[PDB]
């Protein structure tokens, strides 16, 4: 209800993209306009805000954001 809402916020903050377009379906790449470094730093900021401990080993298989949102 509220957790999933704010994951659409984080990845939208650093890349300057609105929350209506940026959703669970919106992946870590393409529509956001993120490179490799931008994607990994978004993955890091996910844990710098929600206090997870991402190993990038789950990030080797998630490419839809939705996977991380639900992972939380």
């Amino acid at each position: 209800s509220t957790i999933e809402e704010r994951v659409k916020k984080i990845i939208g903050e650093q890349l300057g993209v609105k929350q209506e377009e940026v959703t669970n379906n919106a992946s870590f790449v393409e529509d956001l306009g993120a490179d490799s470094l931008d994607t990994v730093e978004l993955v890091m900021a996910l844990e710098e805000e929600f206090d997870t401990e991402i190993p990038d080993e789950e990030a080797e298989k998630i490419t839809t954001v939705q996977a991380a949102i639900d992972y939380i």
Binding site: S36, L37, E41, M44, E48, T52, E53, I54, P55, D56, E57, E58
Partner: protein, 530 residues
């Protein structure tokens, strides 16, 4: 130029027009876009020569190309050198400031740029001042390159000049303040083609490129002449397939449809292709990838061998042609099991024909080849750049002592198998002993609570510089420096102080800076940390 017809000059036009084999009906395939035969290719090369002459390209001009892997790049690989101009290959992975620097340094006259790189040109177009014309390349009939070629005749008489005139140039972004420009002549490229063909064509039954193969590059073709492989494939007159932008599914479809047999790529692309879900049901037992980017891992090699792929390694760099060494297996070594074969195929390899390679110390004393003693590789070959363009001090440091210093530390077997340990500038000097960082990085990466490991040095009073480890932890594992220290101590087989673990001082920094080539910037990490 005085021709003296009895005096033969080694030129690239001889590679094109005096090949090993020429089949006029053999195809050149641009992925799902165009197909034409070798006769059409030879007509289009002459047309491109006519167009370049029309635009005003002389025998000393520079033409720069910003493109993908396509038939247009293959045409530029021939037409521009035969006219007498230098081909400047632009690395599209560099930052726009570095690209602008290289354009200003090389002093290009015409730029051939793909329409997808136009945003890169948008932010540096004002500060260029050398380029007079821009040619936009497209994947449809709107291409200006196609419009310029279909306005010319297919007849042209290519000149004869000295074999020592410069043919190609590109800029390497190694450990230095600014990109360094390497360059090669016609003779060097022709000799590189001949030498590598003699080395890898005469192999008995493993890893050989012959006249029945189908070649498709998976190397971006603006790096080191795509390892000189387009020249070799044109000389053999084999079917060539160009994929364009590298997408794993497109590449797998091309491998299936075109029956590709020979390729070259880097470990990351190969891992992506093997891990793609589309590749599980696809046949692979005719493919002959050569991995030469950097340090083919043993696990990826083992997986590729289990998928029945003839995968082997090779070594080179921008200054060296590039090819200096290739893994070749004697016919007793194909009877070994998958693990020992994987160990053999991951090595640097033996040096190719006409290459002299030694390992030396800082005093250049030519350490023995015993498989344990490690020093820097220094080489002599017929296809090395003599210096850096418009450079003196770095050029002098490159050819110190009469050999070309590759900046790599390796030990050479008794039978000739080279094993590269790590870079010269990554060395860890503790007191009076010399250790690498890559093996420590791998050992710490074997921990179950690390994603990426970076090991750099930290000066000390008595023991000199000491190693320091920078890693990123794993999920729900807030393992501090003490746990990583204990894990390192849990290992064996190390020298120096006990197990060389007394001043590790391991740390954990969140973000590791990564260069435009995907590698971590160790110098920047040192600047930020110390």
């Amino acid at each position: 130029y005085v021709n003296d017809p009895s005096n033969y000059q080694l030129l690239i036009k001889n590679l094109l027009f005096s090949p090993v084999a020429f089949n006029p009906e053999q195809e050149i395939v641009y992925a799902n876009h165009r197909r034409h035969s070798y006769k059409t290719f030879h007509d289009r090369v002459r047309q491109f020569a006519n167009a370049l002459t029309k635009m005003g390209v002389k025998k000393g001009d520079t033409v720069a190309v910003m493109d993908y892997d396509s038939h247009r790049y293959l045409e530029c690989y021939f037409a521009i050198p035969m006219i007498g101009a230098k081909l400047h290959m632009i690395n599209v992975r560099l930052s726009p400031e570095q690209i602008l620097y290289t354009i200003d340094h090389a002093e290009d006259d015409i730029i051939l740029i793909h329409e997808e790189f136009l945003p890169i040109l948008d932010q540096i177009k004002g500060r260029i001042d050398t380029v007079t014309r821009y040619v936009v390349l497209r994947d449809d009939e709107e291409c200006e390159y196609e419009r310029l070629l279909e306005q010319e005749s297919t007849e042209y008489n290519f000149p004869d000049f000295d074999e020592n005139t410069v043919a190609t140039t590109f800029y390497t972004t190694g450990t230095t303040g600014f990109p360094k420009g390497v360059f090669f002549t016609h003779r060097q490229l022709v000799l590189h083609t001949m030498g590598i063909l003699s080395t890898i064509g005469t192999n008995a039954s493993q890893g050989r490129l012959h006249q029945g193969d189908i070649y498709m590059p998976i190397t971006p073709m603006f790096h080191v002449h795509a390892w000189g492989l387009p020249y070799m494939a044109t000389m053999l007159g084999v079917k060539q397939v160009y994929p364009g932008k590298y997408v794993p599914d497109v590449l797998l479809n091309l491998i299936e449809q075109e029956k590709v047999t020979f390729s070259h790529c880097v470990p990351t692309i190969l891992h992506l292709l093997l891990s793609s879900p589309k590749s599980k049901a696809m046949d692979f037992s005719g493919w002959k990838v050569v991995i030469g980017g950097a340090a083919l891992p043993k696990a990826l090699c083992k997986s590729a061998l289990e998928r029945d792929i003839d995968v082997f390694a090779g070594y080179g760099m921008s200054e060296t042609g590039p090819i200096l060494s290739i893994v070749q297996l004697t016919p007793e070594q194909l009877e070994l099991d998958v693990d020992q074969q994987a160990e053999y195929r991951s090595k640097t390899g033996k040096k190719v024909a006409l290459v002299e390679a030694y390992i030396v110390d800082e005093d250049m004393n030519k350490l023995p080849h015993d498989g344990e003693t490690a020093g820097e590789i220094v080489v002599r070959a017929p296809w090395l750049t003599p210096n850096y363009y418009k450079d003196n001090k770095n050029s002098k440091a490159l050819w110190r002592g009469g050999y070309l210093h590759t900046g790599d530390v390796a030990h050479i077997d008794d039978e000739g198998f080279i094993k590269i340990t790590d870079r010269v500038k990554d060395m860890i000097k503790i007191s009076g002993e010399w250790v690498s960082s890559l093996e420590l990085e791998d050992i710490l990466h074997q921990h179950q609570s690390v994603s990426e490991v970076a090991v750099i040095g930290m000066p000390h009073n008595k023991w000199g510089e000491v190693p320091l480890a920078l890693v990123t932890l794993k999920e729900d594992a807030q393992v501090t420096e003490k746990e990583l220290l204990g894990f390192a101590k849990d290992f064996i087989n190390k020298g120096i102080l006990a197990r060389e673990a007394l001043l590790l001082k391991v740390k954990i920094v969140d973000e590791i800076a990564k260069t435009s080539v995907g590698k971590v910037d160790k110098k920047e990490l040192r600047k930020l940390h110390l």
